[PDB]
Structure formats: C-alpha cells, structure tokens
Amino acid sequence: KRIKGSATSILVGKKASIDGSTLISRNDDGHEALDPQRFVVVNPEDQPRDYTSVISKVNVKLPDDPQRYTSIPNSILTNGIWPAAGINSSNVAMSATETITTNSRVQGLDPFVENGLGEEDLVTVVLPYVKSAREGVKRLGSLLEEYGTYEPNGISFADNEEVWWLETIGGHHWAAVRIPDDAYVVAPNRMNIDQFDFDSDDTLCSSDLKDLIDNNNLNPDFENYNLRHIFGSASIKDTVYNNPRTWYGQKFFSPDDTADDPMEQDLPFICHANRKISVEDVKFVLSSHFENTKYDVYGSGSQSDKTLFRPIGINRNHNVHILQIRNNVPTEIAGIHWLAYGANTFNTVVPFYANVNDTPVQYKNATGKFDLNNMYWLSCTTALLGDTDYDFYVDMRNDYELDAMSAYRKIQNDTDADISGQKDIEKYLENANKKLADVAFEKQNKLLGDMVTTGSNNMKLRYNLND
Amino acid sequence: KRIKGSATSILVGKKASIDGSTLISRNDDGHEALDPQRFVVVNPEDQPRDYTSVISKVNVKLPDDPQRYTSIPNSILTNGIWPAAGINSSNVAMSATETITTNSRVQGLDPFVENGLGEEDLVTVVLPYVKSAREGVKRLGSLLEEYGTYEPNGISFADNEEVWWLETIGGHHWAAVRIPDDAYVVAPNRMNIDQFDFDSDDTLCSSDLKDLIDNNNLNPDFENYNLRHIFGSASIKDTVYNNPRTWYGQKFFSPDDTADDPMEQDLPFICHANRKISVEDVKFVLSSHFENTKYDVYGSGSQSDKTLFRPIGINRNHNVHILQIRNNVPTEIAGIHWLAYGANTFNTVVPFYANVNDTPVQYKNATGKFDLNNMYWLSCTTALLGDTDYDFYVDMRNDYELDAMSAYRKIQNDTDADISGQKDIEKYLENANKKLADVAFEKQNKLLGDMVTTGSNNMKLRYNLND
Ligand SMILES: [Co+2]
Ligand SMILES: [Co+2]
What we know:
Distance between the termini of chain A: 61 Å
Largest sheet of chain A: 6 strands, antiparallel
Helix content of chain A: 25-40%
Largest interface: A-B, 22 and 24 residues
Shape of chain A: globular
Number of domains of chain A: 1
Structural class of chain A: alpha+beta
Bound molecules: cobalt (II) ion
Oligomer: part of a larger assembly
Order of helices and strands of chain A: EEEEEEEEHHHEEEEEHHHHHHEEEHHHH
Strand content of chain A: 15-25%
C-alpha cells in the first residue's frame, strides 16, 4: 500500500478576517503520531528542474524560473519531500493536501493513476511557478489533466486578494471555487464543494466536467449540480470522522446558523461568521477536541461518546500552518507563514515572515534523532505529557498560549514598525524570525518545565507525610 | 512567579437598592485558602508620601494631604499591604481588584509593565486623594498612564450618587462605565464591559482608546464597539470559571430575563433586577455555590458536574466586603464598611461604621499565629468544619445568619437613631462598632460550639448502645 496524509483545513476570505488579510490553513496530519518536520526556504537554485517523486515515480519537467518559497518538508525522506505548504516571493500561498473522498461511479470512469501526482509532490511542482491564487489553481489543474493523480485531494490557494479551493476528481479531473471575500470554510477529509455554477467566473474546472456528469448519469439530484453529491461521499464513516469537525468549526464561527447535529451530511461549504476572524480563532478550531460537548475525549462523556468522533487537534498533527497574506502593510512583509509542530493542544503558532532566505535553527534542524533542543521534538513531548492529565495541565497551557502569542505580537509589531528604509529586507526579517523562534523555544521549554515540576508532585509513585 | 488575586464582585446603583444606598462589593479571594486579614483605619499620619510596592517595586510619590480611610490589609506583608477596599472621609468607596482577562492582540500593542501598579497597590494610591467616585476613576486612569500596570483588573468606585466600574486594558489603557442608578452588575474574573458608547456621559476612557481600536484592527464586530469582545476573552475556561458565576447572580436577581445556559459568553454587563436589592441579597450571591443546580459541590450532582464550575463562596474567600454609602441619613453615618472573613458559607457581614479612627480588636488583630479569639481564624475554622458535612450543619448556619443579622440591624438602628448632637462622633461610632464586633464574635463562637457539639455526636469514631 501507499502512505496517506490526513488533515483539517480552514480558509478565510479577505473581508472575513479581523485584519483584512487572507488566511489559508491546515493541520498536516499523518499516519504515525510522530514524523519530524522541518521549516525550510527553497531558494531558486535549490529547486529541481527535473522532478521525480518517491512514492509514484512520476517524472515532471519543471519551468526554469522558480520563485523562492517557504515549505515544511519531512526530515526523513523515505516517502519523499512532503513540503505541505508555503508562501512564494510573489506572496502566493498554497497548502496541499486535505485528503477528501470520491465514489465508485466516477472512479469507474476515471480511475486513479498509479504513476500520477500526490500530496508528496503538489506544492513543489506548483507554488514556485505562479503569481496569483488563480494561476495556482489553473497550473495544478493542468498537471492533474496531464499526469493524473493517485489520491483524492483538496488544495487551498491564496494571494492578497483571493482565496481558492481546488478538489481533485478521479484520476484526471478537478474543480475549484473562489471563496467569497466575506466567507470562511472548514474542511475535513471529505469532498467539500457543494453547489457549483458552471456559468460563474468564480468557478474553474476540467473543460469536460459538465459533460462527464451529464453523459454518464452521475448526478443524483433532480435539479442543479452539487459536486460532492455527484463526486463525493455521504457515508456512515463521514458522520463520525468528518462532519463533526465541520460542525464544531461552524458552531464556533456561526453558532446561530448551525444546528445541533454533528453528523449532518449537508453542512454548507461556504459560511458566514457572526464576526471577523482572527489567527487566534483559526488556531483554536485547529486545536479543538469538541470542548464542552460529550464528544471531548478529555471531557466528562461516556467512553463511547468520548471516542466516537475524530478530533481536530490530534496526536498525529505533524505541523500546523496558517498562511497569511496581509493587506495595508508593505508587500515585503505581507506574507506570514504561521507555524507549529506536534499535537496542537500544547503548542502555539509563530508568525514567521515568509520573505526570508533561510529559517531559524530550532524550526529547521529536526532529524530522526530525538532532540529536545528542536521545536518539533519539544512540542510533541509537551503534548504527550499534557495528554496524560489534561485537566491538570490545561491552566498552565492556557497561560502559556496568551503569554507566548502576546510576545510574538509585540515582536511582529516592532518589526513591522521599522520596515521602512531597511537596506537588506531578508536579513532584517531573518533576524526577526530568529527572535520569534528563540522566544517560542524559551516559552515552550518553560511550559514543559512547569508541567514536569507540578506533574512530578502528583505522580502515582508518591507517599507524602502531610506535615 | 507573581502572586495573583481572585474575586467575585457585585455593584448596585442607588435606585436599585432597597434603601436608596449605593453598594459596591467584592469577595477578596486568594491563591491559598487561608491568608489572615485585618480591618484597619489608615489615619493621614500613617499614610506614606513615598510609596514602594513589594511585588513590582513601583515607586509612587503621593500628595501630602491624604484622607483617612478604612482598609483590609494582609496581616502577613510578604507580598505587600493588599488593602483591598475601603471608604474615605469624603464617603467615597473603592474596591480593588477584580482580576479580569485580556488578549494577545491588545497585549501586543500595549504590554504589561513589569514595574507598574497592581492590586497590591491601588486602594492605597487612589482612595485617600479623591472626593467622588468619578474622581477616583480619573485618578486611577492617570496613574495607569503614568506608571503602567502588570495586571488586568476591574475596580469599583462609589459615592452617595454614583457607582463606577473601571477596567484596565494592557499596560496603560482603561475604560470605565457609570452603572445606571436602577441597575446592578455581577462580575467574575473576566473582562466585563460590553457595548460602549464613547460619546456617553456615562463613560470615560483613555483619550486614545477609540483610535487604538480603529487603527489596529482590534474590533472583531461588524458594527459598534463591545469592549470585552475587543479587549477581553471568550475562552473555554471562561465557560466554567467565570460565566456561571455571572449567570447564577443574574438568575437570582433577573430570573425572567436570564436563560438556562451558565456557559453563555454574552451575558449582559448591566442588568435590571425584578426587585430592589438588599445587603442580605448581595451576601447571598457572594456566598453561593450554585444551590439547587447540579453544579452545587454540596449538592446531588455527579462528581464531574459538582466540580465543573468555580463557585462564588469558596474556601479561599479571604475577606468579603460590601461598601455602602447610605442616603437620607446624616453624612457622618452614611458610610458603612460591611465586613466578614473566611469562606462565606459560614460567616455574616457586619455593618461597621466607616467614620471611625480605629477598629475593633476581634477584626483588627490577626497575625500569622492561629488565634480563635480573632474573627479571621474563628470564621475560617467554622467554614472548614461546615464543609465536612454541609447538609448536616446548614440548618444551624441558616438560623445563625438570621439571628446575627437581626442583632446587627438592631444595633445599627439604635445607633442611627441617637446620632444627633453627639459631641464626639468617631468615639460614638467606634463604640457602636465594638458592640457589633462583640456580638458578631459571640454568635460566631456559639455557632461553632453548636456545630462541634452536634457534630461530635455524629463522628465516625463512635459506637453507641441504642438504649
Ligand atoms: Co526548460
Ligand atoms: Co458572502
């Protein structure tokens, strides 16, 4: 068999955010709980021109003018690079992938292509070569049509104006929708695009998609086109593995527009929140485990209720990224690659400037060797200890989140404030990223220390005299 | 670390009270269950002109004309004075503080000031120098701008006309609301001020507050300004630690305007009760533990429900005070500093006249040495015993509350009735306060005795012949 990713994604249009930025985000989850991640800038000279994948052995000849981009490659390259997500020098963001679903009727017509492209590959072969989110969508579509794919995937694109979501369909087909400026999306591992207008300028797809549907009796609905009804799933597994994640996110942002059934199969794709959305909001949902419901594994529910649903924050979060393209700041500091590692319950995303040529050591240097000086291993260790007694550690966790995010914001604010006239912008921003990573490590380390100190007093292996 | 206070506060406007008085109140809670408190009048000659805090080392030069004021300082000065609350000779009341919440976005712009002011300090540096509640608000606002603060705090002020609530925002900013005459407030450890009209005569704030919000994308709402949405929190921890306290209080006073969800994040700040409010009402809510719900730790709920919410009456109540400025009595007896010590389940507030130069021995003289002749230690001992079998002791508790409060009221009524023509008002009221404290001790001691006598008969270590 082939190794597969898992994920939860959240998208925010430029009018829906609290600061007028676009946000595309994803929990990059995997099969094993731990799989070391690195934060790496791929400079143009480092980018392949003759690309061959490890998993599928697909060979793609690439353009000769790649742009510099951030990425989050695996430390261990057994299954290839797995760059996950990044922002290029044109301030275009891309995250790939959100594994989605398919069905036997479309697979019968356009099967997966064994030697096609996969999540292993997509950012590497698309992001360096596009100058808008729309261009990203179109290039990826072209590559799917030409080379095919062996996975069902959802991919996000953004620039300072637009946010797009592309879903792959069978071995070669695809469709994509531009998320409205004022909207957000929460997307689990299930095909998401619903109502789809072939006549809209805000949609793109395989030229033959409508004919594929119309000519092969793929449409289950009496009227109109709902792509996930046609090409996706509405399974019993969806009701426990996927829909509750969508539901919990929509309950958080749109409480008065969202009913009380986490199993709902027709939750809207495009949503409108009752307020503007912050980075902190996005990280909360990306770290969640159905808090204040009977489905919280750390909560008061029955054993069966507590384990019924797949949470969003999860032991096998490998990285979490929130890619932000800001507006009303100079373009050279618009791109922010927010990043953290390990189960999202005990980390914080750090707002790294994407306009840099290299990355901080604590985030760049993970290998297969356990190293608590590295933020991947330190963050995972913290979350594991936290998992053993969540209610005991959660107050320290909460304090740390506020304290750390406050410190990051102060550094960002100071750095933004002095951008004008900097003679070496990349060096200036690399220094800012170094400060951010240093503080992130210090506060992560201090949190773990506080947890170890208090936790040790509460060990089972104890016997105290109460005097 | 730095030690932090905790609290629950209740405010009542002059038209909302049963007697036309203003009331500002707070449970002064702390980290440890026990921390001995004293009732102390600071005469002008005792007041520092050159003040330095213990926790932050902030140094504040003070005016040379301080007014006399009541206060509730810590017996043990390890972390400074912690005066908590009092009434000055101009019949201005102040209670500080209700620790509240903040968020990373505003902290990123205006961080806490390490060597700034804190709860340790505020009553000492403000109350002696103001002649109205409004002046208190303005002086505190000025001091925050001058010295900064290292805590997020809520502070109440009152005189015979007005009640104000000030909340500190970041290291230097602040906002305050004059509570409508006919309104009340219940405030837990969460930022409270909601809808806020900068043009209102009922509001005061940092001169730059609206610009700070507008220019830095701090406002999450599509319309208007809600200060706690902007500057505060709505966290998962809020739903168990804070909101249920607000909810239980509002359920008590406004049953028909309050829904059934204790976790509600947008309970109103300003409320209107269905009736006029007594001192006895306020003490009840300040002593409460979600009686007649599954969230009552002394009740019938599951272990998880019983311990889910932070109660208002609690083991770490250090003092409880209700500062009352009465109307239509002569000004020399308008100020009443109601006071009790220890967990509020087994004490009663005593209506001490604030117009005095000294305080009764049973309330003034606590040290670190356990002394059951002192009301701090006696009250704490009583509440601890009560905690071991609440349903067994609650009838004696209830009887004592009625009996004791009736005795206090008789003494107050007689004292008020003979105020005219007194040649030495302070001596006259000090004598009344001595009578109050004497009877308060007698009734507290008799309660504990009755509990010990009946409790001893029900000890586990027993074996009786039933004849
Ligand atoms: Co070429
Ligand atoms: Co819209």
